[PDB]
Amino acid sequence: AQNPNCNIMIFHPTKEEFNDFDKYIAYMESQGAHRAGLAKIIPPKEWKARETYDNISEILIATPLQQVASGRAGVFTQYHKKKKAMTVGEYRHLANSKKYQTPPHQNFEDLERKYWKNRIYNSPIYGADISGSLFDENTKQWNLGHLGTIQDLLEKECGVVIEGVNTPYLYFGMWKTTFAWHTEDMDLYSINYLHLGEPKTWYVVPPEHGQRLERLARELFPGSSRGCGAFLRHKVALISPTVLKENGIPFNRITQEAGEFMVTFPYGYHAGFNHGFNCAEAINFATPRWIDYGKMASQCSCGEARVTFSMDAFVRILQPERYDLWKRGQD
Numbered sequence: 001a002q003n004p005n006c007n008i009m010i011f012h013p014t015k016e017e018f019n020d021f022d023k024y025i026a027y028m029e030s031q032g033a034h035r036a037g038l039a040k041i042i043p044p045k046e047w048k049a050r051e052t053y054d055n056i057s058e059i060l061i062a063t064p065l066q067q068v069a070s071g072r073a074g075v076f077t078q079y080h081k082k083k084k085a086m087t088v089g090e091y092r093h094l095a096n097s098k099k100y101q102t103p104p105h106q107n108f109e110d111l112e113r114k115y116w117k118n119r120i121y122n123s124p125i126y127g128a129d130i131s132g133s134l135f136d137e138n139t140k141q142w143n144l145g146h147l148g149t150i151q152d153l154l155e156k157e158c159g160v161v162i163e164g165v166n167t168p169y170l171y172f173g174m175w176k177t178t179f180a181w182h183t184e185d186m187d188l189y190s191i192n193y194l195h196l197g198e199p200k201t202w203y204v205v206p207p208e209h210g211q212r213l214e215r216l217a218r219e220l221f222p223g224s225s226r227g228c229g230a231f232l233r234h235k236v237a238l239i240s241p242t243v244l245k246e247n248g249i250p251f252n253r254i255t256q257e258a259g260e261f262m263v264t265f266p267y268g269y270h271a272g273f274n275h276g277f278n279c280a281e282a283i284n285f286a287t288p289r290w291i292d293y294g295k296m297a298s299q300c301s302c303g304e305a306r307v308t309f310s311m312d313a314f315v316r317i318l319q320p321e322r323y324d325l326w327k328r329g330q331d
């Protein structure tokens with residue numbers, strides 16, 4: 001069995017290997033990459049996402065989200081307070097202001113210590129989930145707006161044609177902006193490209209051990225667990241590495257830098273934080289190996305998780321027994 005310790009693997013494809021996206025994902029899996037839940041892909045030196053980032057300041061963040069924490073430093077939830085619209089140029093200036101800028105630090109490890117010590121005492125503002133793309137249309141390799149769609153994959157594997165679309169999303173971050181512990185909708189893959197700016201630190205639980213994280217989360221967030229049998233779908237709960245180690249939960253960590261891709265694999269729980277002003281692009285995708293995970297994915301039916309139009313068909317076809325209850329949670 002490849003990668004039996006479930007370590008995060010780092011790949012360096014050549015320009016030739018970068019041509020065929022599906023083939024490269026299957027390659028990485030042949031080497032055991034999925035066992036970690038997360039992999040890093042460093043593009044060949046010849047590749048670029050676009051020519052420059054000099055002209056992005058007029059992109060609108062219609063609903064910036066202020067991430068307000070409650071709890072203790074290593075075990076907290078966050079809620080998202082909506083703020084007034086602002087442009088990327090306005091947000092960048094805000095991120096660089098004395099109130100929000102990255103503090104002085106020695107290295108990534110020191111910054112990670114500071115994040116876990118101090119996150120809860122601040123409320124950073126995140127531009128998340130903005131439909132759009134920063135890939136040049138002429139970038140032919142690993143262009144996250146030109147991937148094969150999940151609807152087409154389900155149709156190819158299962159024969160059923162379904163409605164829905166699959167487009168990328170932009171994320172504009174600042175120091176301490178936080179992504180809570182989650183798997184993807186329908187336990188899909190994700191791919192994330194850090195276009196510019198400061199790093200993003202990731203934490204991940206191997207898919208084979210995801211239920212250990214879920215059981216800890218039910219212990220640590222007992223009211224939320226009574227409210228919903230899949231409350232991590234709400235994407236609000238944070239647990240620090242120190243707390244995970246105290247409770248014996250298997251996990252790994254890695255820092256993504258600008259110019260790097262990360263892939264999350266089906267049922268790989270992940271969480272993390274941004275180091276400073278940055279912009280990332282991410283999208284979900286599927287492969288044949290996903291289908292079995294999609295059929296078994298948990299679902300939130302309490303009303304909180306509320307998701308895209310396109311998840312309807314995935315539930316309806318892969319999880320017909322759950323469909324009626326889930327759809328009630330959508331309405």
Ligand SMILES: O=C(O)CNC(=O)C(=O)O
Pocket residue numbers: 171178179190191192200264270280282283
């Ligand atoms: O970058 C972020 O804030 C969160 N991204 C992801 O969870 C991802 O790409 O799957």
Ligand SMILES: [Mg+2]
Pocket residue numbers: 055056057058059
């Ligand atoms: Mg612009």
Ligand code: NI
Pocket residue numbers: 182183184190264270
């Ligand atoms: Ni994710």
Ligand SMILES: [Zn+2]
Pocket residue numbers: 227228229230231233234300301302303304305
């Ligand atoms: Zn719920």
